[PDB]
Scaffold this active site. Structure first.
Site, PDB file in Angstrom:
ATOM      1  CB  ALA A 138      -0.914  -0.002   1.201  1.00 21.27           C
ATOM      2  CB  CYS A 139       0.234   4.648  -1.496  1.00 17.32           C
ATOM      3  SG  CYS A 139      -0.826   3.939  -2.785  1.00 17.32           S
ATOM      4  CD  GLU A 140       1.596   8.853   1.543  1.00 14.28           C
ATOM      5  OE1 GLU A 140       2.235   9.548   2.361  1.00 14.28           O
ATOM      6  OE2 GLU A 140       0.627   9.277   0.872  1.00 14.28           O
TER       7      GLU A 140
END
EC number: 3.4.22.34
Lengths: 435, 432
Positions: free
Chosen positions: B162-164
């Site tokens: 997942a992003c970030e």
């Protein structure tokens, strides 16, 4: 021969006090310098002296302690006369192509020198005028060469205070027209205001706007602080370059550029700014870093300063808050629309890179300037008036022209992008087209 | 003690083929290592296998060439049941909190190991679910703590794509819960999809979507192609880091991170991923174009637009692309304006978008983050999975001791009059 000068403020409203202050201060230097009002044609909307928000009515200043610079400024071309048509006329020397204003052109002879100071704002290859249309670079340069062919001047100096001012001259300004240019910034960075409400070089309490611009203020303070018979154009430039960069920290400053005939840089400055007799015995030739404001931020920081002042008028307060949210809504619409138009023309994997890519220094913004203006009309008809803010988006439009997109493709992309949004009063069929 | 697993895809629609494929793939591996079907819980919306746009109905691939991963994956939690509340119930082993689905849970014993894999998506301190509400870092970490307070395992590994994804653990993950964690990205960069239409290791010509996610596909490809009875946790990490970083790790790859108890690194991977017995004569040691996860869905919608060059449906692709972007600009736009009404044009940006230094929590008050998301969504519209990117903005509004009251005032003026169609929490459910 004799010295002529054009001074232009491309701005409007008490927010942009500094640009009209700048050209007012400029007039005074040339007066103190023995340039005759006869030969000075001041463009300025002229809505600052008697602005309801001016705490000193009739008085404009360009330094926290500085004197009035208004007293004496000719209303040559005010209000909706501050147009690129009248500028190009005023420059060339043709009263039979001027609309309104006091008939004053630069009817100069081959032995004369002209100095031009512009102040407001600018975008890539575009300069602000209070009202649409704007100034487009090739148009400006085309006038300059037309003037050279007329043998209408000996040598010329041009100082451009504006955002991305470099973009007016890069890859389009010849160095064989006896014209030398300086610009507040390169062709891809903001210019700045100083003498701004809560900043290290502080203005008077009563003042809620920037009084001047880092670049503009920098050269005018320079010319009035030196014997202009002793100092050279080149010495000035290298002093204005230091002060405007805040000692080469470009987060809080800009790169002052040189263009055109760099031989003019060896000349004494008084040939262009005149000689103030008072300046005899002044230092011939190291200053603190001035706290500044991003020119593109300033006009919104002003609206906010009022919002916080106007606490105990919830009637009038909520008019500010309304004006703010309307402005930013149009700022956001314009930014968002450009982006989508990119997606629709080039797809969403390579649109950003195509729109916002900057050419190498010295290459021109656009290759077909006719298309640039064309794309901009298309955009405004479907999406809304750029306003002065929308000048930032010219690289985008120019980069569309450079990618060879058909007018039709740009029409559908805009129609698709915006056909559904209601801009209100902000449409070119009310405010006029930017090109 | 027996091994358990929890596999979660957090996303929907043919566009997010990568994520349901990442977890299917994961299940097949874990099975291949002798982890039983009854010990593995699977969260997948289940809208890929029998999707109109699937050139292979009932099939799903997580590799350009590689085989069906969909075959026999349990339908434990699908459709509206892929919920944060079901995820927490399952991990805690609590059958009384489960709503719908199989009612399979992790009732592990003090000598059992657990593996949690998640794929989709994210933004600062928030993981996606196919429908609102989403997963908030604290509620997730809280559940992990509670599980350990009840001694429902020996040790646990958690992989998060997942992003970030860094933002889920940075500042709030203890190192004393017997849980080791790798993320696909730090707390402020993007994770990537690979095996995409145009990209360099290409999918089958038939597929208009990415087949896996770099970090997911890195760890899974590493695990199935190595004797895990020799390979360490740590060794896989390094392998997944170096590949996920790709050529450039700042903008082209990402920084695969480590959080929690780093003693699990010493252990052999087979303890959690099992031992594939057809990998004994398999050695212990061993650049590819990628799509930024946030932009995959538009590369997908476009790749569809270019496969109608077939009208009438072609115009309906551009009807969606514009409706999608239009709302993505509304949110970006709304957030900026709210920051200008709270802090003025000078601060606003610096305040909204400022990234705390590592090992600091994204937010001090999570219940406040949740409230601000609800105030926003009421007045401005559903964040959708896209709007998870704005979570640090909302985190930064909470951290500046702003009132619900003034946040409500800012949003009302910001979004008053804007027509989000059916994208309101009254229709979609609130994101928190």
């Amino acid at each position: 021969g004799t010295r002529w000068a054009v001074l232009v403020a491309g701005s409007n409203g008490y927010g942009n006090y500094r640009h009209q202050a700048d050209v007012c201060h400029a007039y005074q230097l040339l007066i103190k310098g023995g340039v005759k009002e006869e030969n000075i044609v001041v463009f300025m909307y002229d809505d600052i002296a008697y602005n309801a928000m001016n705490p000193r009515p009739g008085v404009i200043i360009n330094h926290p302690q500085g004197p009035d610079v208004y007293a004496g400024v000719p209303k040559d071309y005010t209000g909706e006369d501050v147009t690129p048509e009248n500028l190009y006329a005023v420059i060339l020397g043709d009263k039979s192509k001027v609309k309104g204003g006091s008939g004053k052109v630069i009817n100069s002879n081959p032995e004369d020198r002209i100095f031009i100071f512009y102040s407001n704002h600018g975008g890539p290859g575009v300069l602000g005028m209070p009202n649409a249309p704007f100034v487009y670079a090739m148009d400006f340069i085309d006038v300059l060469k037309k003037k050279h062919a007329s043998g209408g001047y000996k040598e010329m100096v041009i100082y451009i205070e504006a955002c991305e001012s470099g973009s007016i001259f890069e890859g389009i300004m010849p160095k064989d027209l006896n014209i030398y240019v300086t610009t507040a910034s390169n062709a891809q960075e903001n210019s700045f205001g100083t003498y701004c409400p809560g900043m290290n070089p502080p203005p008077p309490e009563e003042y809620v706007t920037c009084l001047g611009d880092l670049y503009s203020v920098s050269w005018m303070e320079d010319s009035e602080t030196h014997n202009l018979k002793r100092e050279t154009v080149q010495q000035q430039y290298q002093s204005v370059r230091k002060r405007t960069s805040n000692s080469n920290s470009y987060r809080f400053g800009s790169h002052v550029m040189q263009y055109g005939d760099t031989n003019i840089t060896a000349e004494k400055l008084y040939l262009y700014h005149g000689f103030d007799p008072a300046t005899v015995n002044f230092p011939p030739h190291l200053e603190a870093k001035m706290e500044v404001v991003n020119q593109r931020d300033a006009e919104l920081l002003f609206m906010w300063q009022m919002y916080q002042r106007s606490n105990h008028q919830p009637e009038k307060k909520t008019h500010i808050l309304e004006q703010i949210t309307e402005t930013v809504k149009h700022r956001n619409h314009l930014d968002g629309s450009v982006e989508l138009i990119g997606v629709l023309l080039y797809g969403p994997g390579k649109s950003s890179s195509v729109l916002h890519s900057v050419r190498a220094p010295g290459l021109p913004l656009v290759d077909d300037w006719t298309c640039l203006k064309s794309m901009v009309r298309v955009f405004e008809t479907h999406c809304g008036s750029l306003t002065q803010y929308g000048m930032k988006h010219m690289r985008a439009f120019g980069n569309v022209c450079n990618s060879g997109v058909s007018k039709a493709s740009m029409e559908e992309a805009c129609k698709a992008a915006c056909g559904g949004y209601d801009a209100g009063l902000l449409y070119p069929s009310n405010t006029g087209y930017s090109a």
